[PDB]
Amino acid sequence: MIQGVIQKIAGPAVIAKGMLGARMYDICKVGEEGLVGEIIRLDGDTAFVQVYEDTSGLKVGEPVVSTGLPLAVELGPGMLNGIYDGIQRPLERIREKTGIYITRGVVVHALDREKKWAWTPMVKPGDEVRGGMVLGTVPEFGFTHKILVPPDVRGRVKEVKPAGEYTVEEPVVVLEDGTELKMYHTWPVRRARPVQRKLDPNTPFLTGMRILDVLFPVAMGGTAAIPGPFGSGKTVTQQSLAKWSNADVVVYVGCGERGNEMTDVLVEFPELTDPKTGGPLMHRTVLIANTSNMPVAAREASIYVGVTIAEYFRDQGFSVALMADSTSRWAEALREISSRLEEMPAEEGYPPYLAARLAAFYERAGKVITLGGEEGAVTIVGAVSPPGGDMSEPVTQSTLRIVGAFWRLDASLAFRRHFPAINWNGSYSLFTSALDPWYRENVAEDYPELRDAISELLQREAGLQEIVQLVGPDALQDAERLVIEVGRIIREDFLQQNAYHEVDAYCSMKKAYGIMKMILAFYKEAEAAIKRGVSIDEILQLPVLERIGRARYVSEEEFPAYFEEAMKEIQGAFKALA
Amino acid sequence: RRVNALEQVVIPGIRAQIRFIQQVLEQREREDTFRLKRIKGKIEAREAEEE
Amino acid sequence: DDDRTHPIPDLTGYITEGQIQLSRELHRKGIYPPIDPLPSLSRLMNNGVGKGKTREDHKQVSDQLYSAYANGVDIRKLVAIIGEDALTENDRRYLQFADAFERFFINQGQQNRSIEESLQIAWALLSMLPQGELKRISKDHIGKYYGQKLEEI
Amino acid sequence: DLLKKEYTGITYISGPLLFVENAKDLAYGAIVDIKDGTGRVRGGQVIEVSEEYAVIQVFEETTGLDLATTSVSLVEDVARLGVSKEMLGRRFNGIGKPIDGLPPITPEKRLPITGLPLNPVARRKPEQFIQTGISTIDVMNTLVRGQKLPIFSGSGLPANEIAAQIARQATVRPDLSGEGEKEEPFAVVFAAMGITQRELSYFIQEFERTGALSRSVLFLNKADDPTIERILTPRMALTVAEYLAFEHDYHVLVILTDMTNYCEALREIGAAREEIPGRRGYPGYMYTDLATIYERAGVVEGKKGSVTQIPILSMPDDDRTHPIPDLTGYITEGQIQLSRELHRKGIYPPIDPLPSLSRLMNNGVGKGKTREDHKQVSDQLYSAYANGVDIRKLVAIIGEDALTENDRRYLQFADAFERFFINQGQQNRSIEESLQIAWALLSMLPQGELKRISKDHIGKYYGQKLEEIWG
């Protein structure tokens, strides 16, 4: 291999000399401790290496060895129910070696080399195999893990191991030209995995939150962005999506965030149960953790590792949801590396190629026909942390040119404990019109009309609230105070949702449809009764107003009867009304 | 009512906008100063290639 | 200059697990300690309260206090423009709650308190509003603690 | 020549650049082939050549390149594109290679992709009125054949649907102009820079539904493609369009999906080379580079064909003073600006008429072209809408109960204008229907307040009620 020595150390950047022959974006092992680094600039006899670990204590003259391969991940059985480093190192195996602190120079295998898997073959000698085909199946925590041919491999099958129990690194299928296929293969994290075709998304991604599933839907192969200031509700939203969504597999990427949140996920999730099958919720989750005090250069690698894992699980036919805890920390890492490289920045110190990297990351989502003929999907929800809440910063503006849904958070709503604190005036979704045939046949035939009616009521209330705040609500007519009160009822009974309640944390589509029906029926009856001269104060004191306000705390089992009782009560109360 | 509305709403918003605009302009000025410093450094470093 | 969007408090708020913000307006009217509840936050609140730790009514009482104080502050902002004659009785009750909050709950000297005394004081102020406005708190907790007056004379 | 000359001796690879020392025989602006150690071949272009070393910008990514086995060989002296009449109905990538699985193009010619400036003596004035079927465009911001009329959009606004509708509904009106020539369909040249899968799928489905794929040439550069390839896509598209129009008498319509991506790639290359920036880090020569693209449209005297340009650009905020829209507005011949406030109220197409402009409107409207009252009606509509918009602010300040009768008339006019003239949906309106609706709206004002309209046209056309058409 190419082998040189350190010439200059400055921060996370090491310049090696004697490296004539190293290629761009290869992996190098720096120093005697074998720190992992990547080549990002070649200059004559030298090479510029960015190290993914801490560079303190290094001395000039230490060896630098190039492995000749780009950064990669090991894809195979044994990846669910685990938590990984930024560069795919299992943390729970690091703990057994180095105690309670993360030290550098630790080398572990990503997949366990000692566990046995029950192998069941699906090919026979004399078959022709291409990339993405299924060699066999292996059981997991209620899943059926398919062993796939690597995408660049082609040949004829010579022999197949019989059904039994083997480890990952044993060749199960030998091809005719000599290639031996194991239970795992490696893939470069900067290359998107191939597919046959890309399809149009036509089914919803059910998040379990009323406002995100009704007003601003997202499809099953779409992308969404959720920006907002600190303490406004990004992490709680993404963890609720992890708990309650209908995805088969969830990949959570905590790039540059607190270490306590990953501990909370690690502790709480084994006790819960997934909505799909039963059994613990952790059996469908993959965790990639890179906290804020961990090395900065590994923030970039964790995102690519997570998206490659999500793409691998897509190729088996599953539906995968991917959450990035903050993509602003990735931009900060890029800025730091470019500052070390002495490049000219574009805006706010960011390198000019930030938007290209962001567009290449988000473009990996979508519903596809896989090379094996099955159908998978990847949906990406990325969180943005703009400085000071300023929504004109480059990272926020670059994200809005590629995402299909824009869920905007507001600090004003979060101050008054109005959660999820989604600004329903500045948010939008481009998937609403494409999901209507699904809604008309899976929820109700008049659901879009009800949703549009609620949006119209919100718009009219927002229009009136400009007049109200300067003249006073007493001067308004009854037909306007009715709209104000109905808007408040919608705002506090429908949009508001508590993520820590035992019942309100999850909401089905039919429960939301029933609540919308109750609110619209009450509004219709009140509008009819206003014309007979009834005061607003008589309507506001009706006992049925409490029934609508308590409707969201009713469990999913008792709701279909509570709904009928409330409808009959509304009709009776407005028929017996003065 | 008009006096109180002006004093409690209109003036603070204008003041906040002025503060924001001034900070943005100052940031752009600082970035341009950094660029000029780099350009002067390159000019100085070019003048000693072969002595 | 009391700016929450300055880089130092903005970057601090992205790392820590909450903040306590002091208020200059509460300082001007002589209230000690001048802690503003609306921009204050504690993210690890829910881990250490509830059933088996302190009391079972802690979280709902906190939510109701926040909602009622927010409504009172909104009404107080409205009064300063229009004037204190167009208010209905409900909004007058919210204003009364808001002014009672600052001088009873927030204000204290070096008076060391217990959690249960403070919960009693919090339930005292929540009894200044009808049971129709206690929308967060469940029906069971209302029949257990509602309806007490200021025992401090 | 037929020999190939290879240049080993690369001394620097970083980002999109590459240095080679003994390459003094490489001409400026040449196209090269960069061969990997494993045989993969990538393209590049010389941007600075000296007797010391030459500088090359690489189109694809630089993964896998090394300083020992990489070699650079000259492909051609000048960047040229092999064009033909048989590229109609084909699909290409951002560098002209086919991606539809069909065999390559046998070139009738090879033309330079930078093009040459048109002689102003050889040009002629655009005169033919184009009926887009949208009232806010046909009546107030008229588009004529041979124009550059970009669309100024935002993040969540439907610019692509408007472009598809314009391409679907566009026609000339020989009966009104009296030319009498039977109209041929527009040929479409479509160039996409950094387009997403959602937008590309929408455009492909629309073109399949309208049956226009037999007349279309497509250059596709997707969002996961290399960034530096975007420098070449609009030049190739405009080269093909100019060839078709000025050699085979086609009437070509050109759509450019996002000029923001082109400017981003330009900024990347400029910042790599340490150029003197303009505003917000964009290079100081962006005006010249953008003008070399927009100024290739028009009509040439003595020839039947024409080139019409409809660029689409998303403003990086809702900011008209950003460098990209500012320079585009300085170069082009007007713009169509979309409004987010109109979009939130459920109005489609959400075209804001006040910041919009068409510079060539006076050439194609009037007596003998559309109708003799077109210009005065447009001016009166503009003045009345501006008055209503200004009265809205007075209402917001003092309240709508202290108004007079005239102010309430203007307020009602503005509301009815937004609800009836702008909002039309997916229907295709003729010019006469749009003028009828416009005269219906103007009849809600007193006859003495129509200052900008001549008294003869007022006598001829005033008085019709709005409910006779929409009631």
Ligand SMILES: Nc1ncnc2c1ncn2[C@@H]1O[C@H](COP(=O)(O)OP(=O)(O)OP(=O)(O)O)[C@@H](O)[C@H]1O
């Ligand atoms: N849906 C919700 N229901 C109830 N409470 C909520 C909800 N969302 C947020 N909160 C409350 O608001 C707090 C906001 O903290 P959170 O971790 O969500 O912030 P964030 O937006 O991720 O901030 P950061 O920028 O620091 O990462 C939570 O700790 C919780 O107390």
Ligand SMILES: [Mg+2]
């Ligand atoms: Mg967070």
